Design a protein around this ligand. Structure first.
Ligand SMILES: OC[C@@H]1O[C@H](O)[C@H](O)[C@H]1O
Ligand SMILES: [Ca+2]
Ligand SMILES: [Cl-]
Length: 302
């Protein structure tokens, strides 16, 4: 009863799933788990003049995201990563912009935007040739090691690791540069997942295409291994204008595959693959920071 990832992706898409509550112009950079049978979603927020973060009140159906409470975090967790860390029975929210290049907080109740612990350092390193520095971290463990992957708005993807026994903890300053391409080809929004029922991991990376933001996919047999391009061009993307089935947006941008198992392995089921993404009206212009990003969900077609 196991499925494989396809070599060519075709999706259907929802429309816009929610409008930002009064005071925000955008909801962004989603991370999501299923928690007690309900979708639990964190994301960045923007007023146009500053970035923050929020959690949606848990909801069973994506069609009900529009009515879900939108709960601001009192301390911003921009571009967050949410997961349950089973070896220490603790939830983790990792993010950027704070006292360190990457930061994390922990909790016993991930539904509370303000129940998170004091911030701790996740990563303290620096990268060359980047206007942003380290951006858009994700975390993923196999059975042995916890990995940090991140981007730099600069065509590179970076990786760090520690024994899982040492997590939650600080990766420190060291990293490996694992991919190098043009800025457009490997820009930001990197995510890594375990493919359930396959000896395979999936990496997606947001690229800047001629027609809008899209995702390029890569596979590996191991988290410390080499990545092989899978659906890695604008014409044959993991997800983009070419194959999203979305009419409301020409951009498929920073989000999260839907993770039914909330744990640190970031496992996705290739039999029922779905993608919570940010998109925007093709008509929306102005400064990047004020763009009206909105949540949508792609469902992989049989
Ligand atoms: O939303 C803040 C930054 O903008 C981009 O969406 C990037 O992915 C994120 O780190
Ligand atoms: Ca992310
Ligand atoms: Cl490493």
């Amino acid at each position: 009863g196991t499925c494989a990832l396809p070599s060519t992706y075709r999706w259907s898409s929802t429309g816009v799933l929610a409008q930002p509550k009064s005071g925000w112009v955008a909801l962004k950079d989603f991370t999501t788990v299923t928690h007690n049978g309900r979708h639990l979603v964190y994301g960045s927020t923007s007023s146009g003049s500053s970035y923050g973060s929020m959690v949606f009140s848990p909801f069973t159906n994506w069609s009900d995201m529009a009515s879900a409470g939108q709960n601001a975090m009192n301390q911003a967790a921009v571009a967050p990563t949410l997961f349950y860390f089973a070896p220490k029975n603790i939830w983790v929210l990792a993010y950027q912009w704070g006292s360190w290049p990457f930061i994390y907080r922990t909790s016993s109740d991930p539904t509370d935007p303000n129940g998170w612990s004091a911030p701790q350092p996740l990563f303290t390193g620096s990268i060359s040739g980047s206007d942003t520095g380290p951006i858009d971290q994700t975390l993923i463990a196999d059975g042995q090691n916890m990995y940090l992957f991140f981007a730099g708005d600069n065509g590179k993807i970076y990786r760090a690791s520690m024994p899982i026994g040492n997590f939650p903890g600080n990766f420190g300053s060291s990293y490996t540069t694992i991919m190098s391409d043009t800025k457009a080809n490997l820009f930001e929004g990197v995510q890594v997942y375990k493919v359930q029922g396959q000896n395979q991991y999936l990496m997606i990376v947001e690229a800047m295409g001629a027609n809008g933001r899209y995702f390029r996919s890569f596979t590996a047999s191991s988290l410390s291994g080499s990545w092989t391009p899978q659906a890695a061009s604008e014409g044959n993307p993991f997800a983009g204008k070419a194959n999203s089935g979305a009419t409301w947006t020409n951009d498929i941008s920073h989000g999260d595959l839907v993770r039914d198992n909330p744990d640190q392995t970031m496992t996705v089921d290739p039999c029922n693959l779905q993608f919570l993404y940010q998109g925007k009206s093709p008509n929306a212009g102005g400064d990047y920071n004020s763009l009206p990003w909105r949540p949508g969900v792609l469902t992989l077609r049989r």
